[PDB]
């Protein structure tokens, strides 16, 4: 279930308040741009299916497609960033709280270690 049962997770909450501490996704984010591209493609497909000019019919319709896609995508990206930040935060906290389970291996230089040479003939 991974983080589905995290402590303090308010049910049916798209974006908790703690997400606001994270930087908001830029309105020029490439992922959001791709979302808008998907919206425009949806508009074109809608025009094609309804046997109306693909690149000109219902400019308002295509505009609404793009706006809806971008608008929902912004919050989608914000939630995605929040969840990944939760992942990193929890992982780091667990490593800190369990030092024995995450030891620091001795750092040896290549001059010290011995790697078998496999000749290519």
């Amino acid at each position: 279930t991974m983080m589905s049962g995290r402590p303090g997770r308010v049910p049916l909450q798209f974006l908790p308040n703690e997400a606001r501490s994270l930087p908001p996704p830029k309105l020029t984010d490439p992922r959001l741009v791709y979302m808008g591209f998907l919206g425009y493609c949806s508009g074109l497909i809608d025009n094609a299916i309804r046997r109306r000019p693909v690149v000109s019919a219902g400019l308002h319709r295509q505009l609404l497609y793009v706006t809806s896609f971008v608008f929902f995508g912004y919050y989608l990206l914000k939630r995605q960033d929040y969840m990944y930040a939760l992942r990193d935060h929890d992982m780091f906290a667990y490593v800190k709280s369990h030092p024995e389970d995450f030891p620091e291996k001795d750092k040896k230089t290549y001059g010290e270690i011995l790697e078998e040479f496999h000749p290519v003939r």
């Binding site: 040896k108 230089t109 290549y110 001059g111 790697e115 078998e116 040479f117 000749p119 290519v120 003939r121």
Partner: protein
């Protein structure tokens, strides 16, 4: 222009011409004709172009890289140091290849220059090339297509272990 130390050319020994026949050597007349009709205009054109170059005199420099810690002095997963060391190793590999090429050029020039006496008059060049060949082969051979500094390190370590075993016996 080039370094005669890098490219040794023995001092030329041209014999003096001593004609013993009244017949005039055609080669002499032909060479005079060739000089007058070819070398002279070619030299004049060269001089003009050299003047033009002398007017527009600009210089290009030789980039020199500082020494970087080798892969031996590099951490297990330190990709930054590993990248630095690997680039250094590849540069040194290229330099070694060019050294081999220089010695080979020496050998070939000796073979042609000494003519029929090449076998006895190119011993030094042959020995030099043999030394360089041995060194280059021991350092860089059988590493594979995906050669790396770590591979040379491994080969050297294996060689050193074998040397230790031999010396202990």
């Amino acid at each position: 222009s080039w370094d005669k130390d890098v490219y040794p050319e023995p001092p030329r020994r041209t014999p003096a011409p001593a004609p013993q026949t009244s017949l005039p050597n055609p080669v002499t007349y032909l060479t005079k004709i060739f000089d007058l009709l070819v070398d002279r205009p070619v030299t004049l054109a060269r001089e003009f172009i050299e003047q033009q170059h002398a007017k527009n005199r600009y210089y290009y420099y030789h980039r020199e890289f500082r020494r970087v810690p080798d892969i031996t002095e590099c951490e297990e997963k330190d990709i930054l140091c590993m990248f630095e060391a690997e680039m250094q190793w590849r540069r040194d590999y290229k330099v070694d290849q060019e050294i081999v090429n220089i010695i080979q050029e020496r050998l070939k020039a000796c073979q042609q220059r000494e003519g029929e006496s090449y076998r006895q008059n190119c011993a030094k060049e042959l020995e030099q090339f043999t030394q360089v060949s041995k060194a280059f082969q021991d350092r860089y051979s059988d590493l594979g297509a995906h050669y790396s500094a770590r591979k040379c390190l491994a080969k050297q370590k294996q060689r050193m272990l074998a040397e230790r075993k031999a010396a202990k016996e």
